[PDB]
Design a protein around this ligand. Structure first.
Ligand SMILES: *[C@@H]1O[C@H](CO)[C@@H](O[C@@H]2O[C@H](CO)[C@@H](O)[C@H](O)[C@H]2NC(C)=O)[C@H](O)[C@H]1NC(C)=O
Ligand SMILES: *[C@@H]1O[C@H](CO)[C@@H](O)[C@H](O)[C@H]1NC(C)=O
Lengths: 193, 596
């Protein structure tokens, strides 16, 4: 039996930043969701769309799995119909979302003494995101009525800032790796079973 | 735009200040818990970075009008950012002030005196003089220690204090304030609505409006102790006179708690001082702090964080590193809370644990407020919040519940009287000291006392206000007030006067809310979530609303009130009056024990 590549998306040395999440199209595989609990400690596994028990006897088309790393305060913002600073400018989910989310704590793996600034998030996007839009572009954000032409000063700002994770922050401001799954059944033959 | 243009600026500022201020706190904690040469330089650089960034942000924020614009929250945040303060000085003045403060700290940290009979043995204050001032029963030896500490450190702080006060008044004048005393007093200015108004000028007139009503309560307490101390050192006491300044239970006499065994009414009843029981039953620092945490859990307050236990000091390090044993509660930032304290198996440390954990709880309460408002409502609330828990934890009923007191113990007229006397010796004894110190420092900062009359005015007001006399005249060349930690480290002291009233007000409110009935001094709010919620609903406010509204939300008042304190200390006033039937109540300036 051809297993489905979940270990290489759940077990990675480095995830991606919040503002540029790493989408992965998964198709033509045998989805074994029981190995998800093999990790064990999950901050939140209650998840939307389907029943608590996964109902492995469900055949879908291609499934998308995109992951990132956020704080512990913003884990609750990954939900349909939820607003805030991260669900408006970085990652938005549809109101009729099918599929659900997984999150767990990781502080002894991606948080080093002296702070690591490789994790960045977007602020001041000038317009709330539509579902599944990335906007990697980094141009200074205008705040006022003066034409700043690429120089950040006065009332013109840079949209990206660093988390700067260090150990001993407490659960609130401590790294939390998040991976989400979106299930699609848009006609066509069913492959992911 | 103004409003929407300032919201964006505040959003930018918050999540950059929150990261550039954590490093300074971490470096300071590392230096304090481990004294070396690298840590001092790291702290010095981390402070400079934050100072420069704060200066730039304040300059940027100053030009935002605020005539009639914005919401109240934005207005409060932006005015707090604009007020600047210590960063409105040039580099020359800044570096001079920094090196003056560093030299103050270095002199005060490692002050030493030596035994006249044995010159080799020279002792510090923390392990060497604290024990002497606490337990030593030799009058001449106590006078020796007092004179040595006043003669060593007092020599080395006078010019430093002169330069420091000069620079502070100059900085306050540059900050659009009258003086640095007004800078200190500006914390009580509340202006958020009509009715919720306060002025910087009105604080001083409220002080004596509550001192005079407490003055005759202290006179009967001062006289009774002096008559009790007549027999302790029969030759070395003048009943027709004041009290010696060194036989006050400490180096200066801040707390008269050590005088309780020398002033106890009853000697037959079981002693409420449970240090012996704590030593015998096998307690340690972990047990003390777990017992302290159980009280807050029972009241209905959050548990201690996991990192608190793994990061707090809580004990002397021994080992081979030097630390600072001044108790503190640390809020490093980003959700990190730690406590530094050199605990010992006594009762003073048992209550200090409750005090510091109350500080920690209040810090935890307002973690969700914005960065510029993550503060107490005013400087006099942290101490009251800390002490309203020790008040409930010190009662004999609570002591008997945890098994410290015998299970056959019986409360009577003796127990209540002794408990009230012990509490009064601490609470009442510190108010004159606090008032005198803060008033004297305010006159100094206003420049009303010349350098040739500092000691004269200090001792004259001490004699006519507190009523304690000196064994030998200290010449004006010294600097007596600088010998205190708060004076040498530039800490506000009127908070220690406002606590002694806010704590009683909050205690009475919590007793009323907890459905308790009886006398005030047997409250013991425990296992009652009503008081916990009533306290938390105001603790969580932080600095978002004026201190008048913050007080009203719990008490239903809008200013200071001595009536709860008088209610608490009612059963002692009558007894003191009746027992002082043959008392010479009154002290005089003219009587000085030494010749001339
Ligand atoms: C107390 O501080 C000293 C120096 O400030 C520490 O000694 C150094 O610590 C750093 C930190 O990793 C390392 O270079 C070495 O461990 C030490 N240097 C040398 C040359 O030995 C000391 O470790 C600190 N104490 C504690 C308990 O952390
Ligand atoms: C993840 O990878 C590490 C090292 O490659 C391995 O030790 C661990 O068992 C893996 N986790 C799994 C297979 O759940």
């Amino acid at each position: 039996t051809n297993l489905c590549p979940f270990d290489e998306v759940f077990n990675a040395t480095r995830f991606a930043s919040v503002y540029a999440w790493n989408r992965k199209r998964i198709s033509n595989c045998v989805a074994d969701y029981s190995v998800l609990y093999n990790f064990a400690p999950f901050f939140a596994f209650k998840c939307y769309g389907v029943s608590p028990t996964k109902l492995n006897d469900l055949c879908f088309t291609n499934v998308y799995a995109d992951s990132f790393v956020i704080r512990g305060n913003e884990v609750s913002q990954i939900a349909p119909g939820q607003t805030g600073n991260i669900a408006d400018y970085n990652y938005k989910l549809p109101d009729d979302f099918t599929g659900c989310v997984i999150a767990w704590n990781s502080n002894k793996l991606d948080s080093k003494v002296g702070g690591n600034y490789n994790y960045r998030y977007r602020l001041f996007r000038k317009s709330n995101l539509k579902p599944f839009e990335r906007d990697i572009s980094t141009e200074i954000y205008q705040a006022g009525n003066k034409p700043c032409n690429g120089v950040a000063g006065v009332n013109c700002y840079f949209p990206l800032q660093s988390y700067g994770f260090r150990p001993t922050y407490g659960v609130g401001h401590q790294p939390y790796r998040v991976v989400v799954l979106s299930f699609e059944l848009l006609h066509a033959p069913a492959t992911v079973c | 735009l103004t409003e929407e243009n300032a919201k964006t600026f505040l959003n930018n500022f918050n999540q950059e200040a929150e990261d550039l201020s954590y490093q300074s706190s971490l470096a300071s904690w590392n230096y304090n818990t481990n004294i070396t040469e690298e840590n001092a330089q790291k702290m010095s650089e981390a402070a400079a970075k934050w100072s420069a960034f704060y200066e730039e942000q304040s300059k940027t924020a100053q030009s935002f009008s605020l005539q009639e614009i914005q919401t109240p929250i934005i207005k409060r945040q932006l005015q707090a950012l604009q007020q600047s303060g210590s960063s409105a000085l040039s580099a020359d003045k800044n570096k001079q002030l920094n090196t003056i403060l560093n030299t103050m700290s270095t002199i005060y940290s490692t002050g030493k005196v030596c035994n006249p009979k044995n010159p080799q043995e020279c002792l510090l204050l923390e392990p060497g003089l604290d024990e002497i001032m606490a337990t030593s029963t030799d009058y001449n030896s106590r006078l020796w220690a007092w004179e040595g500490w006043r003669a060593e450190v007092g020599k080395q702080l006078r010019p430093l204090y002169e330069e420091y006060v000069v620079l502070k008044n100059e900085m306050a004048r540059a900050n659009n304030y009258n003086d640095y005393g007004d800078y200190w007093r500006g914390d009580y200015e509340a202006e958020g609505a009509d009715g919720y108004n306060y002025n910087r000028n009105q604080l001083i007139e409220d002080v004596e409006r509550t001192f005079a009503e407490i003055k005759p309560l202290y006179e009967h307490l001062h006289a009774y102790v002096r008559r009790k101390l007549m027999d302790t050192y029969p030759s070395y006491i003048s009943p027709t006179g004041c009290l010696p300044a060194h036989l006050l239970g400490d180096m200066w006499g801040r707390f008269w708690t050590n005088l309780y065994p020398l002033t106890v009414p009853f000697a037959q009843k079981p002693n409420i001082d449970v240090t012996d029981a704590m030593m015998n039953q096998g307690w340690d620092a972990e047990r003390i702090f777990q017992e302290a945490e159980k009280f807050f859990v029972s009241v209905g307050l959050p548990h201690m964080t996991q990192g608190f236990w793994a990061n707090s000091m809580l004990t002397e390090p021994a080992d081979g590193r030097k630390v600072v044993c001044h108790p503190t509660a640390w809020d490093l930032g980003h959700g990190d809370f730690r406590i530094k304290m050199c605990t010992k198996v006594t009762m003073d440390n048992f209550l200090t644990a409750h005090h510091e954990m109350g500080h920690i709880q209040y810090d935890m309460a307002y973690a969700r407020q914005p960065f510029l408002l993550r503060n107490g409502a005013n400087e006099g609330f942290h101490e009251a919040v800390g002490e309203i828990m020790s008040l409930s934890a010190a009662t004999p009923k609570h002591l008997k519940s945890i098994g410290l007191l015998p299970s056959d113990f019986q409360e009577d007229s003796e127990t209540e009287i002794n408990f009230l006397l012990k509490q009064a010796l601490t609470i009442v004894g510190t108010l004159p000291f606090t008032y005198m110190l803060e008033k004297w420092r305010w006159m100094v900062f206003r420049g009303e006392i010349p350098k040739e009359q500092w000691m004269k005015k200090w001792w004259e007001m001490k004699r006519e206000i507190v009523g304690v006399v000196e064994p030998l005249p200290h010449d004006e060349t010294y600097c007596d007030p600088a010998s205190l930690f708060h004076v040498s480290n530039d800490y506000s002291f009127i908070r220690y006067y406002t606590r002694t009233i806010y704590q009683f007000q909050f205690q009475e409110a919590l007793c009323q809310a907890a459905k308790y009935n009886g006398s005030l001094h047997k409250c013991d709010i425990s296992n009652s979530t009503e008081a916990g919620q009533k306290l938390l609903k105001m603790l969580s406010l932080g600095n978002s609303e004026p201190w008048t509204k913050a007080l009203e939300n719990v008490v239903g008042a809008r200013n200071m009130d001595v009536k709860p304190l008088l209610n608490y200390f009612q059963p002692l006033f009558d007894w003191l009056k009746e027992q002082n039937r043959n008392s010479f109540v009154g002290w005089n300036t003219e009587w000085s024990p030494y010749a001339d």
